[PDB]
Amino acid sequence: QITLEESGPGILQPSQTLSLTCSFSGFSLSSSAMSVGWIRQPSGKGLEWLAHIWWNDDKYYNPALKSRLTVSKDSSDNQVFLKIASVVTADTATYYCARIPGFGFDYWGQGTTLTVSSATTTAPSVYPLVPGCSSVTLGCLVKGYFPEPVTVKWNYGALSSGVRTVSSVLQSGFYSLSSLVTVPSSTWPSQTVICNVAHPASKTELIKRIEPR
Amino acid sequence: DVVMTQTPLSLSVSLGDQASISCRSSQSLVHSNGNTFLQWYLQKPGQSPKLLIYKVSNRFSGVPDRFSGSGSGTDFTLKISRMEAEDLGIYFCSQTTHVPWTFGGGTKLEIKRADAAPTVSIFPPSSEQLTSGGASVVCFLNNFYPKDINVKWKIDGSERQNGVLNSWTDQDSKDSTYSMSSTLTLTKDEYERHNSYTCEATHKTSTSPIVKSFNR
Numbered sequence: 001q002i003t004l005e006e007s008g009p010g011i012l013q014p015s016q017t018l019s020l021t022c023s024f025s026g027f028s029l030s031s032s033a034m035s036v037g038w039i040r041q042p043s044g045k046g047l048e049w050l051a052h053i054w055w056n057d058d059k060y061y062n063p064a065l066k067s068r069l070t071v072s073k074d075s076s077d078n079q080v081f082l083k084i085a086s087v088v089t090a091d092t093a094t095y096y097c098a099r100i101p102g103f104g105f106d107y108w109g110q111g112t113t114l115t116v117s118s119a120t121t122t123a124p125s126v127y128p129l130v131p132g133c134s135s136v137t138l139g140c141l142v143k144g145y146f147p148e149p150v151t152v153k154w155n156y157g158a159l160s161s162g163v164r165t166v167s168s169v170l171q172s173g174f175y176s177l178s179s180l181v182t183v184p185s186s187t188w189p190s191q192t193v194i195c196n197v198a199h200p201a202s203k204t205e206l207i208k209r210i211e212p213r
Numbered sequence: 214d215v216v217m218t219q220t221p222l223s224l225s226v227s228l229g230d231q232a233s234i235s236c237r238s239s240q241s242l243v244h245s246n247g248n249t250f251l252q253w254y255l256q257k258p259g260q261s262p263k264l265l266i267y268k269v270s271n272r273f274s275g276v277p278d279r280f281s282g283s284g285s286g287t288d289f290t291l292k293i294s295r296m297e298a299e300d301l302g303i304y305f306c307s308q309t310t311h312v313p314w315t316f317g318g319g320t321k322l323e324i325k326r327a328d329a330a331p332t333v334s335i336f337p338p339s340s341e342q343l344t345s346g347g348a349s350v351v352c353f354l355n356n357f358y359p360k361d362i363n364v365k366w367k368i369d370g371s372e373r374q375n376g377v378l379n380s381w382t383d384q385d386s387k388d389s390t391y392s393m394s395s396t397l398t399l400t401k402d403e404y405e406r407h408n409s410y411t412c413e414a415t416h417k418t419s420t421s422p423i424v425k426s427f428n429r
Binding site: 037046047048049060062063064096098100102103104105106107108109110111125127128129130131132133137139141143164165166167168169171176177178180182 | 214248250252254259261262263264267268273305307309312313314315316318319332334335336337338339340341342345349351353355378379380381382383385392393394396427
């Protein structure tokens, strides 16, 4: 059961220090051969290796960023840390930690998305798509929010087939998307259909029941 | 730094067909030890990268037989022998033999399937949005191929282009289709001013638009 999970602020103002944590299980550093690395990807762009720390405390840094970067570990707590000093707009990216046994990267955590902005965090408003107010298409629309990302689920994740979630659109400083599911008629409205929208940056966990009229 | 050149930038593959992805190195990827550390990853839409092939040719616990790697020194190839629906996403090569560790630019692999006409749905603004002074009319083109689609909005039979935001999904993992939402956003006052609200998809499967309207 190898797993890796990263955590960050979600949003950070320019010039301040970014502090990322990589929590893991299924392996140990201080176990030998054994490394955890940091990789970043700006939206729709390439992957950039940042740094990695080995079991023996050997640290390796990307020269283009080196003097701003600091990797460290706490092997007893199964955690790796990355510090990025005086952060700029270009540091906006999804950050990953990944295990290195030998050779590469194998896994790969979920990523933590970071936005470098001077702006207030704004939670989303979530609205029915109801038709209209054999199979039926329903949805949740998902306006007003900052920064990215938002997570949208249906019936707390139990409804996953038929889900279509379009990519976000930025306009006037705010993002929006919509997520739709096609169910069976029989289905809805006889059974409950709920969207779960999470916005970690504003600590938002909201829910919309899809009601007919 | 070692520059990784990936070819092609994008590939459209029919199901069951073969696909090759090239990765070329600016320096030799043979380490002193003397392994060759070239890895292949698939990043699926909305997911983190997954290791497919490590050290040129080793296929990683869980990875289907359909994926294979070959090459030596400076020239490397990922092969997918039979294309399946779930093999959608962006493929990347890593070098880890030289610091700084560098990646290829990526190859977006898209699946080429039979043509599919969209299923169109229109959604009036919700009462909860209307209560706060806003009105978004959403319309919602499900499961076309190919990706190229046009939406036209009509208010009382007159075309509207202001306040329209369009957005696509990523290609689907099971049926290989696209979806897109077109959203016309107005104020409550402006929405309450008009009656007929119309959206129409033209798509290459039909020269005639699929039209959906509500009146309120």
